[PDB]
Structure formats: C-alpha cells, structure tokens
Amino acid sequence: EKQIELIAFYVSHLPQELAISQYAVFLENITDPDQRQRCLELAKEAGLDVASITKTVVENTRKKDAGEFAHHDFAPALDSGTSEEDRAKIDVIDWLVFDPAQRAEALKQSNAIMRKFLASKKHEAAKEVFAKIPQDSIAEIYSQWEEQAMDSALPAEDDNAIREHLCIRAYL
Amino acid sequence: LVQICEMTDNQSRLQRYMTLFAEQNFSDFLFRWYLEKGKRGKLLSQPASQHGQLAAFLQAHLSWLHELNSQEFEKAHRTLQTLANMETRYFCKKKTLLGLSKLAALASDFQEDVLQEKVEEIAEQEHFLLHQETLPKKLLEEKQLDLNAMPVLAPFQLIQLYVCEENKRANENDFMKALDLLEYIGDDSEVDVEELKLEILCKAIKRDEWSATDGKDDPIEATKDSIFVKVLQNLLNKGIELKGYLPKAETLLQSEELNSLKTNSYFEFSLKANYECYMKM
Amino acid sequence: DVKEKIYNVLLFVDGGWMVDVREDTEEDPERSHQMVLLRRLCLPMMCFLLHTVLHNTKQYKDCLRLADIVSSENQKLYTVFSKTEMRNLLQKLRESSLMLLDLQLDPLGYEIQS
Numbered sequence: 023e024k025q026i027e028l029i030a031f032y033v034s035h036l037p038q039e040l041a042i043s044q045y046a047v048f049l050e051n052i053t054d055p056d057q058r059q060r061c062l063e064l065a066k067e068a069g070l071d072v073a074s075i076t077k078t079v080v081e082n083t084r085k086k087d088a089g090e091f092a093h094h095d096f097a098p099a100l101d102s103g104t105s106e107e108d109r110a111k112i113d114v115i116d117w118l119v120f121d122p123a124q125r126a127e128a129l130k131q132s133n134a135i136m137r138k139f140l141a142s143k144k145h146e147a148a149k150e151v152f153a154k155i156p157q158d159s160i161a162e163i164y165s166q167w168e169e170q171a172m173d174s175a176l177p178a179e180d181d182n183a184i185r186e187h188l189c190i191r192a193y194l
Numbered sequence: 195l196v197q198i199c200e201m202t203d204n205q206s207r208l209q210r211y212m213t214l215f216a217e218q219n220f221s222d223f224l225f226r227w228y229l230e231k232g233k234r235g236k237l238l239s240q241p242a243s244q245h246g247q248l249a250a251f252l253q254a255h256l257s258w259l260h261e262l263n264s265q266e267f268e269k270a271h272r273t274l275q276t277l278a279n280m281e282t283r284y285f286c287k288k289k290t291l292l293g294l295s296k297l298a299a300l301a302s303d304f305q306e307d308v309l310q311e312k313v314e315e316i317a318e319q320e321h322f323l324l325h326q327e328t329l330p331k332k333l334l335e336e337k338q339l340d341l342n343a344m345p346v347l348a349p350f351q352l353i354q355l356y357v358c359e360e361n362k363r364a365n366e367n368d369f370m371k372a373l374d375l376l377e378y379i380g381d382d383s384e385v386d387v388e389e390l391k392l393e394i395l396c397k398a399i400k401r402d403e404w405s406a407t408d409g410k411d412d413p414i415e416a417t418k419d420s421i422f423v424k425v426l427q428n429l430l431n432k433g434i435e436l437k438g439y440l441p442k443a444e445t446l447l448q449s450e451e452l453n454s455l456k457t458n459s460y461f462e463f464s465l466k467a468n469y470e471c472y473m474k475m
Numbered sequence: 476d477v478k479e480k481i482y483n484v485l486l487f488v489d490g491g492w493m494v495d496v497r498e499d500t501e502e503d504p505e506r507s508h509q510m511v512l513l514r515r516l517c518l519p520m521m522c523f524l525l526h527t528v529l530h531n532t533k534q535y536k537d538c539l540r541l542a543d544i545v546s547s548e549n550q551k552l553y554t555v556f557s558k559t560e561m562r563n564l565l566q567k568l569r570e571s572s573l574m575l576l577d578l579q580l581d582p583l584g585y586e587i588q589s
Binding site: 090091093094137140141177178179181182185186189192193 | 480483484487492493495496497498499500504505506508509510512513515517521
C-alpha cells in the first residue's frame with residue numbers, strides 16, 4: 023500500500039533479521055539516487071545495520087546460482103552475452119558502493135562481477151565495473167585500511183582482488 | 195638434363211610434375227641434388243622470392259618440417275635438443291632452442307614416465323645455463339660485453355665474478371652463493387677446491403675494511419660474521435653432524451694470504467677473536 | 476605501444492598474470508578454477524597477437540624472442556599452452572625464421588659471419 027512512514031515502527035517490534043531482510047527487499051525497488059541516499063539517512067535515524075544488510079543482499083544474490091565451476095572439457099559454448107541473471111549480479115554491487123566505508127565489500131563484489139565478465143571476454147564491461155569504484159578505488163581501499171588503525175598488510179582477499187584487477191587492466 | 199633445366203629456372207612445379215609422372219625419380223632427384231652440392235638445388239642461385247619461391251617450395255623438400263606439416267612433436271623435441279647442444283655461437287639462441295624443445299616435449303604424447311625423463315634431463319641443461327644467465331650486471335658492462343649477442347659461464351667463472359673488486363655492493367648473499375657454487379666443479383683435486391675456499395674468505399675480509407675507532411678494535415667483519423651465521427641451517431634438528439662441521443675454513447694458512455695482501459696487522463686481532471666464538475658456535 | 480602492453484600481460488610481475496601471491500585466505504575453488512581457465516585462454520592468445528604484430532611489422536628477430544619468454548621459468552607460460560597451441564606457435568616462429576633467411580640473416584636474426 024506504499025505506507026512508507028509507518029513501516030519502520032512496526033518493523034522495530036520484530037526481530038532484526040526481519041528488519042534487515044524487509045528493508046533490503048524495499049531498497050531493491052529504489053532506482054533514484056536522491057531517494058537512495060534519503061532512505062539510508064532514514065534507516066540511520068531509525069537503527070538497522072546497513073552494513074550487514076547490504077552484504078547479505080549481495081551474498082543472497084550470489085548464492086541463488088548453484089552454477090558449478092566446471093573445467094573447460096565439459097561446459098558447452100556458453101552464451102558470451104550478459105544474461106538478465108548476470109545483469110542482476112552486476113547491479114547488486116551498487117548496494118555496497120553507496121557507502122565510502124563499505125569500500126572493502128565494493129571491492130569484493132566488483133571483483134566477483136569482473137571475474138564473470140573476463141571469463142565471458144566482455145573486457146569493456148569489466149573496465150566499466152573497474153571505473154565504477156573510481157580510478158581512485160585502489161587508493162581508497164588502502165586509505166580506508168590505514169584509517170582503521172591497522173599497522174598490518176591488507177587482507178589477502180583484497181590484495182589478490184587488487185592484483186586481479188591490475189591483471190584485467192593490462193589485458194584490456 | 196631435365197632436372198638441371200628445372201633447377202636453373204623458377205619451375206619446381208616442373209620438378210614436381212617430373213616426380214609426379216615417374217618411376218623412382220624421387221630417389222634420383224635427391225641423389226642428384228647431393229652430387230650437385232653447391233651446383234644445383236641451391237635457393238641462393240635461384241631468385242627465391244618470386245616464382246623462384248614457388249621453385250623454393252619443392253627445392254625445400256626433412257622431419258624437422260615434418261612436425262610443422264604432421265605434428266610430430268616428439269621428433270621435433272629430439273632435433274630441437276640436438277641443435278641446442280651443438281649451439282656455441284649465441285647464448286640467447288641456445289636458451290631459445292631448449293625452451294622450444296621443452297615446449298615441444300610438453301605438448302607431445304610421451305607417456306608420463308618418458309615425459310618425466312625428458313624434463314629431468316632438460317632440468318640439468320637449464321641448471322648449467324642458469325649460471326651464465328645470473329652473471330652480474332656490473333661486470334658485463336665493465337668487460338664491455340654484449341647482453342645477448344655473447345657466450346655463457348662456469349662455476350669457476352661465476353665464483354670469480356661474484357667476488358671481483360668490480361662487484362662493489364657485494365654482500366652476504368653474493369659470497370654465500372659463491373660458496374654454493376663449489377659443488378658444481380668437476381675434478382675438485384685438479385682445479386684446486388681449497389685454494390678458492392681461501393681466496394673468497396680473504397676478499398670477504400678485504401671488503402669488510404678492518405679499522406679502529408679511538409684506539410679500539412672496529413669489527414668490520416660484519417659480512418664474515420653474517421656468512422658464518424648463514425652456513426648453519428640449524429642442522430642439529432635436521433639430524434646432520436652440525437657439531438664440528440665448520441673445519442672447512444682454514445686458519446694458519448689464512449694469515450699466509452693476509453700477509454700477501456699486507457692486511458695482517460689490521461685484522462688479526464678480531465680474526466682470532468671471532469674464531470673463538472666460532473669454536474663455541 | 477601494442478608490444479609494450481602485451482609484454483605487461485606476458486611478463487606480469489611476481490608469479491605472472493592472474494596468479495594469487497597471498498595464500499593466507501580461504502580457497503575459493505570456483506575463483507581459482509576460473510583464473511586457471513582465463514590463463515589458458517588469454518596468455519596463448521596474447522602471444523599469438525604479439526607474434527602477428529611483430530611478423531607483419533617485419534620485427535622477425537623479436538618474434539623469435541617469444542620462445543625465450545614462453546619457456547621462461549619466471550612466468551611458466553609454457554604450462555598454460557595446449558599441445559596444439561604450442562605446435563602452432565612453433566610453426567609461426569618457423570615462418571618468421573624463414574623470413575630472416577630471405578633477409579640474408581641467420582635463423583635467429585644475427586648477421587651471417589661470412
């Protein structure tokens with residue numbers, strides 16, 4: 023019934039897990055960037071874990087496919103085109119790209135999309151994803167890790183994802 | 195006659211048409227080619243680039259090519275290795291032929307056992323070559339040597355080049371690797387093993403620089419120190435007789451070489467001093 | 476420019492193109508499988524494109540240096556080539572070597588010492 027002003031209160035009288043899952047399904051229908059920002063402000067003024075929610079949305083979208091990693095000897099000539107299901111996996115990364123801090127999740131999710139595009143020889147689509155997190159995305163990942171007061175090297179996942187992105191760049 | 199007419203022109207379409215309609219003219223044309231060594235069958239006498247490269251196509255008539263036109267990888271590997279062995283003129287080419295030989299064998303249909311033998315005998319060839327490959331870029335500009343358009347090296351040459359005065363920034367690793375290259379010799383009692391064992395441990399002290407600061411000993415032996423810290427790989431827990439396994443180095447025989455360099459007065463204070471905590475180590 | 480850019484792929488630093496350097500993470504078997512497939516796909520292709528560029532531009536000596544690069548233990552590029560691709564590479568290298576002989580050079584692109 024689109025009664026937006028009422029939902030947050032009734033959701034607070036329910037378990038967090040339901041608040042995260044329902045607000046996530048609501049935000050999936052929001053395409054307008056100004057409305058996206060306004061919804062995150064309203065969610066913060068209330069109180070859910072935007073960070074665990076947007077991570078869970080991306081993981082759920084990744085887990086919908088039981089597509090096994092089959093070696094070359096048994097996969098037919100797969101359509102090298104971006105399917106509607108591939109499009110949904112590309113567009114789910116936008117959830118983690120809204121917040122500057124979620125930079126670690128933006129990197130993990132963009133790497134996972136770039137892996138699919140590189141396998142499909144869609145080098146221009148992989149460059150567009152790489153550019154999305156900006157020509158500054160690598161510097162931003164390092165800056166955010168330094169700001170968390172960690173005198174340690176980057177997580178092996180994020181360092182390998184940066185390296186994979188630089189490999190794809192050199193190839194494109 | 196007809197075979198030398200087909201050879202003065204650019205018509206090896208004719209010598210193909212001659213061998214197409216003949217009884218045994220193949221066994222004749224090859225033996226007629228060999229007798230005519232430098233006389234007929236040359237592609238340098240023919241203007242081989244035109245219709246004379248259409249002549250060159252049949253006068254190019256062979257198993258190396260056999261791989262290109264029949265995929266006999268195993269045969270290509272045998273000839274590629276044979277060419278790599280006779281190669282003496284160009285180091286860069288000897289390296290390339292072995293690479294190609296190895297890629298030909300890896301892409302061939304050898305049984306896993308045969309493939310393992312070929313890649314092991316090859317690993318030896320890569321092992322010797324890797325010595326000339328690792329030649330320091332200080333000495334190759336000092337001796338004014340061409341980078342690729344020149345010849346390779348032996349453990350003697352490598353050991354001697356690692357320790358040259360010219361190797362200015364020579365640290366613990368350069369000397370350690372110049373003592374690792376002693377098991378690669380051949381005829382150890384002929385070529386003097388323990389002479390070189392001294393030559394190196396003595397230039398290992400010349401680079402150290404034994405000095406004095408305010409009337410007190412200056413232990414420059416920081417590299418000699420470090421090299422004797424690097425010989426022991428903790429072989430006590432490896433079950434090796436590490437206890438009593440530094441009598442490789444000499445002592446009284448060392449100060450003989452130190453006298454030749456004129457450096458005995460400087461370093462003989464801490465040479466013995468460090469040789470006491472090397473009998474405790 | 477093409478030669479430089481293809482060499483940045485073939486000679487990619489620290490263990491080669493699409494290889495993880497940090498093993499202190501959980502193994503994603505789907506990711507590691509896809510990376511091995513992309514190496515078998517992209518690296519032979521890049522070597523053939525570079526051969527084609529160098530051959531068409533008459534840099535036949537640099538075509539033969541691709542054998543040294545493919546056989547290099549630093550990048551282990553020889554492990555990602557199929558037996559058919561390795562045969563096709565050797566055929567293409569032979570074609571460039573024949574063009575050096577037509578230029579009165581040795582099979583490796585050195586001056587024939589008379």
